[PDB]
C-alpha cells in the first residue's frame, strides 16, 4: 500500500505540513495543489489522478467533478455534526468543555459528508492557534492514519451524520473587546477565539486595532481601558474588573502588519512607565512573563514565549541576558525550552519588515541570534540542552543545534532550511554544528530539502538526540527526568571535564569564530547584495500575498519530467 495522495490546502500550513510528514515518512506520495481557483483544483486532480484526496485546510468549496471522481476527505475542526467555517472560534466563544475534530467526505451541502473518523478532547482555556496546533493536529493525525487503513482494506463504509448544527462565519461585532463592559475573563475569551486570526477588534489610546496574545494581570489595576504599564513592548490595559496584557496588535489598515503593541501604538504611549520583571524573579500573582527562568534539581530551565516563534533583535538580547544569568548559577545543566507551541522560528520577519531599513534590521537580528548561539557554545562547565516542545524552522532549528543535546516532542515539525525565505545561507554556527551531527554531505542535503521533516525523522537521521512524549507537558516531564538522571551519573562529570578542556582551548574558539565570520559574510551578501531574493520572499510572507499557482516543489503533477 503505497498510495498517491493529493492535498488541497489554502496554504501549506502547519497541519498540512504535519500530515505531509506523517504520510511521506510512511512511504506514501503526497502532492500538493494550493487552493487558488476551482479550475486549478480540477486541473490538478486530472493531472495527478490521486488514489485519495485530503483537504487539510479549505477556503473554497471543492468542485463537484473532483470529489465525484476521486475519494475526497475533508478536515473539520469540530466534532461530528458540527458544520461551518469558524468551528473553533465558536467553541471558544461558547466555552465548550469538550470539542473534537472530524474527517468527513466531501459533499454538495457544506460539511454534510459521511464521517470517516473523529477524535474528541477536553478543551483548554487557550488561544485558538494553540488548540489547533496541539489537540486538533494530534487528533487529525489519528483520523487520517485510521482512514488510510480503512481505505486500503477496501470495504469501509463511512458513518452518515445524524444530528448536526450550523454556525456561520463569526462577525467582528462578536469579537470586539469593550474595556468598560468586559471583565478580564471575557477579554481573554474574545482574544483567544480570534488568535492568531482574525484578531479581536478594539480601541486602544484612540486607535482602532486588532488585539493578539492576551494574558491576565492580577496586581496592576486602574480604570477600564487605561494603559497601566509597558513590559517588553506588551501593554497592560484596565478591564471592568481588572487588567489584561496585549503583546501584539495590528492596525485596521490595508497595508498594516501584526507587530508588538508598543510599535503599533508608538508615540501614543509617551509617558507610560516600563514595569520590568526579571525572568529569575519569583512572583505569586498572574502577570505577563515573556521569559521565565526556574531551577529544579540542579537544572536551570529557560522558557521563552516569543510570539509566533519569531525572535526579534530585542528578544534575542533579552534571552542572552537570561542565559548569562543562568551560566552564573549553581546549576549542572541549562535547558532552553522555548514555548509549548514553538521552539523557535528564527529572525522576526515582521519587525524586520517594519524597520526603516529591513537590511540593517536583518543584520541586527542575525548578529543578535548569533550572540545567543555563541554564549551557549562557550559554556565549558555546564550541560546545555534544547527541549523542542513545538515546531522549529530556519534559524530556530540551528539555534537548538548549538546545545549539547537536542530533544523534541513527538509530532514536532522541523524546517531545517531557508528555502522559504529567499535561500538565506543561514548562520547560528551551522557550519560547525551541522557536520558534527550528520556529516557535510547529508547536512547539505538537509538544507536543500524544502519539505518538512518530523522530529522522528530528525532523530533517525542523527540531527537530534531523542524524541519522546505526546504533549508539551509530558515532554517536559520526561526531559527533566532524563537530564536529572544524567547529571547524577558518573558519565556527567567525565563529560564536563572534557568539555572544560575543549571549550577553553584557543583552537576550538578560533574555529567557531571563523565559522561565524564565514556565515555572516554570506548573510551580508543575502541582506545587501544586488540580488534581493531574500527581501522579496520576506515581503510575500509577512504580507500574506496570495498565490496564483502552485509551485512545482509542492505540485508533483506540475514538474517538468512528470508523467503517469
Numbering used by the authors: -1 to 562
Sentences from the paper on this structure:
The crystallographic analyses reveal that HypX consists of the N- and C-terminal domains that are structurally homologous to the hydrolase domain of FDH and enoyl-CoA hydratase/isomerase (ECH/ECI), respectively. HypX will catalyze two consecutive reactions, the formyl-group transfer from N10-formyl-THF to CoA and decarbonylation of formyl-CoA, in the N- and C-terminal domains, respectively, to produce CO. The putative catalytic residues, His74, Asp80, and Asp109 in the N-terminal domain and Ty416 and Glu426 in the C-terminal domain, are perfectly conserved among HypX homologs listed in the previous report. CoA is constitutively bound in HypX, which will act as the prosthetic group for CO biosynthesis through the formation and the decarbonylation of formyl-CoA. CO produced by HypX is used as a ligand of the iron in the NiFe(CN)2(CO) center of NiFe hydrogenases.
We prepared and determined the crystal structures of variants in which mutations were introduced at amino acid residues interacting with CoA to elucidate physiological roles of these residues. Further mutations on Ser194, Gln195, and Asn306, which interact with 3’-phosphate group of CoA, resulted in a decrease of CoA binding affinity. The Q15A-R131A-S194A-Q195A-N306A-R542A variant showed two MS peaks due to apo (CoA-free) and holo (CoA-bound) form in native MS analysis while only holo form was observed in wild-type. Thus, a loss of hydrogen bonds with 3’-phosphate group of CoA decreases CoA binding affinity of HypX and these hydrogen bonds play an important role for tethering CoA in the cavity.
